[PDB]
Design a protein around this nucleic acid. Structure first.
Lengths: 191, 56, 129, 64, 49, 141
RNA sequence: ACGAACGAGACUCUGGCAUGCUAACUAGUUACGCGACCCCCGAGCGGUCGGCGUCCCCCAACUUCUUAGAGGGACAAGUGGCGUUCAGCCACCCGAGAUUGAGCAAUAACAGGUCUGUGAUGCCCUUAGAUGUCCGGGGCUGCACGCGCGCUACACUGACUGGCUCAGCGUGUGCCUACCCUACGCCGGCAGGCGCGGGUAACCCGUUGAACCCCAUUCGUGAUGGGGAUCGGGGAUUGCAAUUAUUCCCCAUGAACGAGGAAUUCCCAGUAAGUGCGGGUCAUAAGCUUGCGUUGAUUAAGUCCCUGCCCUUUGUACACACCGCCCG
């Protein structure tokens, strides 16, 4: 429990809640903080400790999906801090709070299961558990960050920083921010 | 295990026998048996033993 | 955490809590180092579980009349309680009311006793149909 | 048709069974309404205390 | 309860619905009124409440 | 002796042995400069405890560590465990309890993860599968 | 119903709490005597602080670390909740909290496979123009399709050259008869030529001075320096002999490919995956095997809804059991 919480480039406290319905799932003070996040996935004990696992560690560990890229982890975290810096430079204010509110604004709301009333496959809407909500937001913004730097010019960090800009600070500017309306309107008419 | 050859053909034989000796005799295995506990001569503290002494 | 335990410890407990009980420990560490000398087993796996279930036994020993173990303390105390002093109960209770039907019956015997002729005669309809 | 937004404090959950979408039956009390009790369903991690997000106060889940 | 929340009277004495529900044997099987019983346990009885 | 501490520490298998030593106050990992293991991305990594355990308690220590095995960040937690493992006895055995009180608590004030590392390791491949748990695919015709 | 077993628990290994135990001049250390060599290396260019896989000859020394013998962990053990406090289950303090995975190995039998592991083995068969035997050339590797097991990717987190950041798996000299594990400099570029030398193995390679994570660097979303074959031209290298490239290396040839619709597997934890390295075949030797090993992820802690064991009720013309009888 440190005497000052800093990244060597900006501060580590000053993280809050925006839509209370996701309290205790976005985590920034679980029990500590670090110069820069790194982990094995140690919080894999249950669903609850990965529900209340820190957000920066959450995203830094999560951004290694497409196979052999967890086989390049140092430079990947170089990319993540690069992207946070790119946000800090383009849009100014601290990128971590902005990504907090961006996950909030690009969280889904409901999921529809497949229970045929008389036999034909229908859908039925259940309220998205807030943890699955935040994870859909983060882990489909990561999908967008790959779909961008896969079929575009921008590198990984630049794509990620653009997405975190235009998610909370822009409408219809994310693969996640369209998945959101798709899921919620599906839930409406498929109640 | 063993084979036998016959004018009509082979037969196969297998014999599986426990070892005889409870102790570790020549073909006796380990002394204990892989089973429960028991008593050979347990100890209690039953008989009245009240304050007096003896001087040896 | 844990698993439901076996016959090799059920026997190893309902022998030692029978004989070694008064000389058996009150907590696990004691139970295990008791097992080291007065147990004969080919391992420490059986020994650790014996010590755990003897911890269980002392959990269960002083817990009132307990049906899941048997020891001297229990044996004697229950027998000694049954060894009892009937309070003044030859009359079995104080003054007794009895029925005129019973009195007329005991007329055949030409018998009576401390009597008050309990009256309970009329009925309100009986066993449910 | 109206869509009241609501913040459903889950007063209890009822097991992860019935439908194999890792759903969960809940009996929220919305902090706000008294004689309206919409018994609902969710999907995934839900503990008592945190309000589930609601666009519409009318999704009553008993297989309806 | 909702019906009572916005009501003229507080809550009304609620006239019920009473029905003599009928099933065939095979529709009882399909729709789970009861099911089978043992080769003796069929003798003793416990209808649905 | 009675004047320094030389004991071990390690990740899954990467093993270091750290020796905190009375002197002017110096830190050296692998018998090489502190930062200069040089992951060149985890330049931030191994000065979190060094700047959060007490700059005063990093004034009398002459750290020398002898290391081998495995991978890079594994050896990094090897040294990070080893130095704490040595200094804890440095404080408790030779020295009183008040001196202990600060750093014994700062142990979990960083994390309890350092006194003993993972009880984990990679284990033997199981055949019919390309790793430890996977299985070679099941084909048909 | 009782008194009984075998199959599970038991029977072992592996990984993990061991700052206390046990000692190796064939191991390491060596903390100690920067002592002898070294640089002044540096602010300073001095006292000393820093770095020598630098040695001490050995009749100095110890197992922190080190390979590990025994000693010894861990058993719902305690308690916060539930049951009937029955056998137990979630949690937290003592932290290793149960259970890290690998092993070991039934009764009836299939008629599934084994006589081309055998001189294991019954019939009959070949028995001098051999299916016994030594050998030479070819075949087991020929291509209009289909399939699976498969290595390399579809490029920007691509990646090109150069630096330096970082091991344990195991084999290791003649064999049951031919070729054992390594290192030094001299040349050609590497392949490749050269001879001196360490070793029957904690001696020695190798403090395996292991890659992909690292970074400088670049042109620039361009079948593009990619993904990199095809084939051309050579060079060596084992071998009685590489011709339908068996392997190695280069100039150079520069192609099919833009994460793939038909079905399906795998894993919910140092686990998938990325993955260099070992070991089996040998005169030649791995995209295979099966281990070492690292950088280590998405969500999951529920459920039999899909395919599937076991249970109970319970109909059966079925007795090779629904791939069965079966009927006009």
């Amino acid at each position: 429990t440190p005497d000052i919480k800093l990244f060597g480039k900006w501060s580590t406290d000053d993280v809050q809640i925006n839509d209370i319905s996701l309290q205790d799932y976005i985590a920034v003070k679980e029990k500590y903080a670090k110069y820069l996040p790194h982990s094995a996935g140690r919080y894999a004990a249950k669903r609850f400790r990965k529900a209340q696992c820190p957000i920066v560690e959450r995203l830094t560990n999560s951004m290694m999906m497409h196979g052999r890229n967890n086989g390049k982890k140092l430079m990947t975290v170089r990319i993540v801090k690069h992207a946070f810096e790119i946000i800090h430079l383009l849009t100014g204010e601290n990128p971590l709070q902005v990504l907090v509110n961006a996950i909030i604004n690009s969280g889904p709301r409901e999921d529809s299961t497949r229970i045929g009333r008389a036999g034909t496959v229908r859908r039925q809407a259940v309220d998205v558990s807030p943890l699955r909500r935040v994870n859909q937001a983060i882990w489909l913004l990561c999908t967008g960050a790959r779909e961008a730097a896969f079929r575009n010019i921008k590198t990984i960090a630049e794509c990620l920083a653009d997405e975190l800009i235009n998610a909370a600070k822009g409408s219809s500017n994310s693969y996640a921010i369209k998945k959101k309306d798709e899921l919620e309107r599906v839930a409406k008419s498929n109640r | 295990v063993r084979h036998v050859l016959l004018r009509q053909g082979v037969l196969g034989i297998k014999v599986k026998i426990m070892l005889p000796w409870d102790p570790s005799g020549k073909i006796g295995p380990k002394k204990p048996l892989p089973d429960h506990v028991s008593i050979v001569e347990p100890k209690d503290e039953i008989l009245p033993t009240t304050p007096i002494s003896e001087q040896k | 955490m844990g698993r439901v335990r076996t016959k090799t410890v059920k026997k190893a407990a309902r022998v030692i809590i029978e004989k070694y009980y008064t000389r058996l420990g009150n907590d696990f560490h004691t139970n295990k180092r008791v097992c080291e000398e007065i147990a004969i087993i080919p391992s420490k796996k059986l020994r650790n579980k014996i010590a755990g279930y003897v911890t269980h036994l002392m959990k269960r020993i002083q817990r009132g009349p307990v049906r899941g173990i048997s020891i001297k303390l229990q044996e004697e105390e229950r027998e000694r309680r049954d060894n009892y002093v009937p309070e003044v109960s030859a009359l079995d209770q104080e003054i007794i009311e009895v029925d005129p039907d019973t009195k007329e019956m005991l007329k055949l015997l030409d018998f009576g006793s401390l009597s008050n002729l309990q009256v309970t005669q009329p009925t309100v309809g009986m066993n449910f149909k | 048709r109206v869509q009241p937004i609501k913040l459903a404090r889950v007063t209890k959950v009822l097991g992860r069974t019935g439908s194999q979408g890792q759903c969960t039956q809940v009996r929220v009390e919305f902090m706000d309404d008294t004689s309206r009790s919409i018994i609902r369903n969710v999907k995934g991690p839900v503990r008592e205390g945190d309000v589930l997000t609601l666009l519409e106060s009318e999704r009553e889940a008993r297989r309806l | 309860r909702d019906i009572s929340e916005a009501s003229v009277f507080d809550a009304y004495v609620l006239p019920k619905l009473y029905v003599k529900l009928h099933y065939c044997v095979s529709c009882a099987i399909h729709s789970k009124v009861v099911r089978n019983r043992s080769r003796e346990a069929r003798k003793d009885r416990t209808p649905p409440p | 002796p009675l004047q320094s501490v030389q004991v071990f520490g390690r990740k899954k298998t990467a093993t270091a042995v750290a020796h905190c030593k009375r002197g002017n106050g110096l830190i050296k990992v692998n018998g090489r400069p502190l930062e200069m293991i040089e992951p060149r991305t985890l330049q931030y990594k191994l000065l979190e405890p060094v700047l959060l355990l007490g700059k005063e308690r990093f004034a009398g220590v002459d750290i020398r560590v002898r290391v081998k095995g495995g991978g890079h960040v594994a050896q990094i937690y090897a040294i990070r465990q080893s130095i704490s493992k040595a200094l804890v006895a440095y404080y408790q055995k030779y020295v009183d309890e008040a001196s202990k009180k600060e750093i014994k608590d700062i142990l979990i004030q960083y994390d309890r993860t350092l006194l003993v590392a993972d009880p984990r390791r990679c284990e033997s491949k199981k055949f019919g599968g390309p790793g430890a748990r996977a299985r070679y695919q099941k084909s048909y015709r």
